[PDB]
Design a protein around this ligand. Structure first.
Ligand SMILES: Cc1cc2nc3c(=O)[nH]c(=O)nc-3n(C[C@H](O)[C@H](O)[C@H](O)COP(=O)(O)OP(=O)(O)OC[C@H]3O[C@@H](n4cnc5c(N)ncnc54)[C@H](O)[C@@H]3O)c2cc1C
Ligand SMILES: Cc1cc2nc3c(=O)[nH]c(=O)nc-3n(C[C@H](O)[C@H](O)[C@H](O)COP(=O)(O)OP(=O)(O)OC[C@H]3O[C@@H](n4cnc5c(N)ncnc54)[C@H](O)[C@@H]3O)c2cc1C
Ligand SMILES: COc1ccc(NC(=O)CN(C)S(=O)(=O)c2cc(Br)cnc2N)cc1
Ligand SMILES: COc1ccc(NC(=O)CN(C)S(=O)(=O)c2cc(Br)cnc2N)cc1
Lengths: 465, 465
């Protein structure tokens, strides 16, 4: 078969399927090509099921640590197999949801793997073995990324990516997680709570090393108290799968040590999917770090080909991929659009308990860049609902420029603080300062009141602390 | 014993103690008079302990009724006695915090009950037995409110207000609650989850009658499945306490009906405390509904006397009282401030599960007032986080004026949606439109994403529904 579309989308993750919806809304005939995962990594083996598992693990944590406090009597047991099953039900529901949205928007689904032949044509190897050719006026590449392996190591039966681990109904006795980013922590949290022995190795001197140092310290303390072992400033040298166990050679301070465990999880980063589908034929240029290069409108060096989501390596998160997809489709149609701006300002979160949530500049980053830095910090031990909820740990930390009280960054750790970010990002985007923000009344009692107190701290004096 | 202060606050609830802090920060020498409740109703027997109890009740529901879904096994029971005990610790902890804040801000605590003798003099019956006269330049009345009883009814052994009820360690077999406001629904939710059979009697034809109609219906549906009986359009006309049971005569037109239970809770509302402390001798005028009259700066008819919090009847919530206290103290100091404005725009929430949270106008209010009304509604069944957490019910409903996309109201029901209001009220308070709100990128996966979907809905079309 041969057909022509205004827009063809490569990949059906949050980037692609949203970009496709948006193009269809703006009146463009749209097709979307995907061989495996509708809803991409996020809906099938990423954000969606993992958040279901973390919820289960939180309930375990609540019991095994706070049963006495909440007046719980009983020997209560938690089957991981049921946590697993529920994670699959939840993923399956949303994937079906994607299909509903494609149909609602009259978007043509093409089930196969797509490869550029020219800058205007796409060769698709269909899953049933056949072929079809799609010619397009515009293409939106949303092919995502794949796991980056520790150099010189490989995958095997007991050395896995997020993908094999998140799909395991059965659980290992012990695991070593390479990398202490968002995904490494979240997996560490779920597995430990469910009885697995967990060791996490990070090369940089901090867990969650992109976060504010005050946040890294807080989350490390919580994990050590949970019983997870975190090795920082430590380099994975080699990984040996001996069947009955995995042997991980590790160096710190010029001292090699061996760590053993049943399994090893590789979670040190994600490399953009860029090879094997004809970017060269299309004339699309890569960056130094082998991501697809793009301007502020997600346009590649080829005027009519766009690149959105993890494949551009700018900030590998689903909400980013969604927003870039919307940018790309509006630019194609000629519709009114706004670029995302500096991606450092975009919000980010980790969903273990305590939650981690942030946007913009850390305290130290702000000082290093020449700002007149003001900082306000409010511990959740001074918040009424945090005590009411049983988790007074953590804090809200804002950093601003003193001249006008403009927000440069927000850094939160505590119970479900991921939900508290939008007031901040809204303020940052539309130039609302601490002084305007301090005049927004917050409902009592919520965790959100800690935001109000920080706003006050920036302009002068906190009340409740 | 004589003494003098620039400002004397009467009452130490949220309104009083925050007013005193803000006054201290502004250089004014400050005293605060309170005989029983430091932190007032809110911290001692109101918001704070009740939120702890609701947390406990939430966990009861999950560990019993949702046990199988979460793979929870074993025989498990919850002791309400421990839920009570924890609520008391949480309360005393916050009450302690109030004393520290007084001490930090150099506020003089007067322990006793104050009565006005004139417009500039206050007589205090001290708890230690003595007395002392206090003279002042500015007074801030923050004397709170008291439960209003169903007309022609009486408190007794088995007919209580929130105060006796929340301080009970043991539970009754049955209870009838008069009033389907926030306090009634919250006691309804706690007690039902702990196995009490609960009946709620509301005179108006809806539960939570001040919310949007869609919200009232949804929460009624939720309470029904919980096993709470709600009787709407129903007038309580007599309560007879037989010692071993209580007889409630009820009228759902045009017929009388008898309801029986071990206890009855009166929760139909609150009347400002304006009697027995010399308001007449200071020349402080009362409104029609017997609240203390005030202007937009909380000034009474006596220029140097202010009334904040529940005593002015404007909106009986803790965050409102705090906010008014700041306005009062700031106006007194000759400091910059901003009046709260139309109190309908202030946020409010009910903290059962699912939460109810709202601000501004209901849809039908906006239509009646001649707005060109746009309404966008997003259900949480289409939200990833909601499924992952195990509570996909409820929705987010926004209403706006079609001219510029200005928000008029927001109305949320669902898991912990109280935390989602800040973005919305900041937008309304600074005239940010739906178009600008739609560009604020929300972290995935969060309940907060439901907001972003609604913003897009107000602008044109939603993506994920
Ligand atoms: C365990 C885990 C947890 C995560 N949790 C979160 C979280 O909580 N919050 C968050 O924001 N992010 C989270 N992420 C990240 C998130 O998964 C990604 O940001 C997101 O999936 C990116 O969307 P995408 O469309 O850009 O790429 P993808 O989601 O990977 O979708 C890309 C798709 O393109 C397809 N494709 C590739 N090549 C071709 C081709 N030649 N032809 C056709 N199709 C092709 C692939 O099959 C794939 O389905 C998590 C990731 C993992 C691994
Ligand atoms: C069960 C329950 C749950 C609630 N939950 C919430 C909630 O979740 N969120 C929310 O926002 N609100 C909630 N409220 C309402 C909230 O408690 C009140 O709005 C708030 O306490 C008002 O603060 P206030 O300072 O204005 O008055 P108060 O809190 O009542 O404090 C007033 C104080 O003044 C003192 N006083 C009175 N007369 C004198 C005098 N002559 N001399 C000296 N002192 C005097 C009293 O002793 C009292 O301590 C709840 C109320 C109840 C009953
Ligand atoms: C009426 O039928 C339906 C079926 C499905 C939907 N919508 C969805 O399922 C919705 N997404 C698929 S989603 O998984 O929740 C999601 C994914 C991402 Br990435 C961002 N936001 C959402 N809401 C709406 C309506
Ligand atoms: C150093 O010791 C402390 C500990 C805690 C505090 N602050 C508090 O306890 C704080 N309030 C008493 S509170 O109950 O939480 C509260 C009540 C109201 Br009304 C609004 N906001 C808050 N935070 C101060 C000092």
């Amino acid at each position: 078969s041969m057909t022509h579309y205004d827009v063809v989308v490569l990949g059906a993750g949050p980037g692609g399927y949203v970009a496709a919806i948006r193009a269809a809304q703006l009146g463009l005939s749209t097709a979307i090509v995907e061989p495996k995962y509708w809803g991409g990594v996020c809906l099938n083996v990423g954000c969606i099921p993992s958040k279901a598992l973390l919820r289960n693990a939180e309930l375990v944590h609540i019991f095994t640590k706070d049963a006495k406090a909440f007046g719980i009597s009983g020997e209560v047991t938690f089957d991981y197999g049921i946590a697993y099953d529920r994670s699959r039900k939840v993923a399956e529901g949303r994937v079906a949801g994607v299909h509903f949205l494609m149909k609602k928007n009259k978007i043509t689904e093409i089930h196969g793997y797509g490869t550029f032949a020219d800058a205007n044509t796409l060769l698709v190897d269909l899953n049933d073995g056949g072929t079809e050719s799609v010619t397009f006026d515009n293409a939106i590449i949303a092919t995502g990324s794949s796991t980056r392996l520790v150099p010189g190591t490989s995958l095997s039966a007991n050395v896995v990516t997020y993908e094999e681990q998140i799909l395991s109904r059965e659980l290992p006795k012990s695991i070593i997680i390479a990398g202490a980013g968002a995904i490494g922590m979240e997996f560490g949290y779920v597995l430990k709570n469910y009885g697995v022995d967990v060791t996490i190795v990070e090369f940089l001197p901090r867990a969650l090393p992109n976060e504010d140092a005050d946040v890294s310290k807080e989350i490390e303390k919580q994990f050590k108290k949970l019983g997870v072992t975190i090795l920082t400033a430590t380099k994975v040298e080699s990984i040996a799968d001996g069947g009955s166990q995995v042997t991980v050679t590790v160096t710190k301070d010029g001292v090699a040590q061996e760590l053993k465990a049943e399994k090893v999880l590789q979670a040190i980063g994600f490399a953009p999917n860029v090879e094997g589908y004809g970017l060269d034929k299309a004339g699309v240029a890569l960056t130094d770090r082998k991501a697809i290069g793009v301007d502020d409108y997600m346009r590649t060096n080829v005027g009519h080909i766009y690149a959105i989501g993890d494949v551009n390596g700018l900030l590998q998160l689903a909400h980013v991929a969604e927003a870039q997809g919307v940018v790309a489709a509006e630019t194609i149609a000629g519709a009114e659009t706004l670029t995302l701006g500096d991606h450092r300002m975009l919000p980010r979160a980790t969903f273990c308990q305590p939650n981690v949530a942030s946007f913009g500049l850390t305290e130290q980053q702000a000082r290093n860049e020449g700002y007149d830095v003001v900082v306000a910090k409010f511990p959740f031990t001074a918040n009424a609902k945090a005590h009411g909820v049983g988790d007074p740990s953590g804090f809200v930390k804002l950093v601003a420029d003193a001249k006008h009280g403009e927000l440069l960054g927000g850094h939160l750790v505590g119970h479900d603080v991921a939900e508290l970010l939008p007031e901040l990002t809204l303020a940052q985007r539309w130039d609302l300062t601490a002084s305007e923000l301090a005049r927004n009344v917050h409902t009592h009692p919520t965790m959100s009141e800690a935001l109000q107190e920080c706003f006050h701290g920036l302009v002068g004096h906190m009340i409740n602390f």
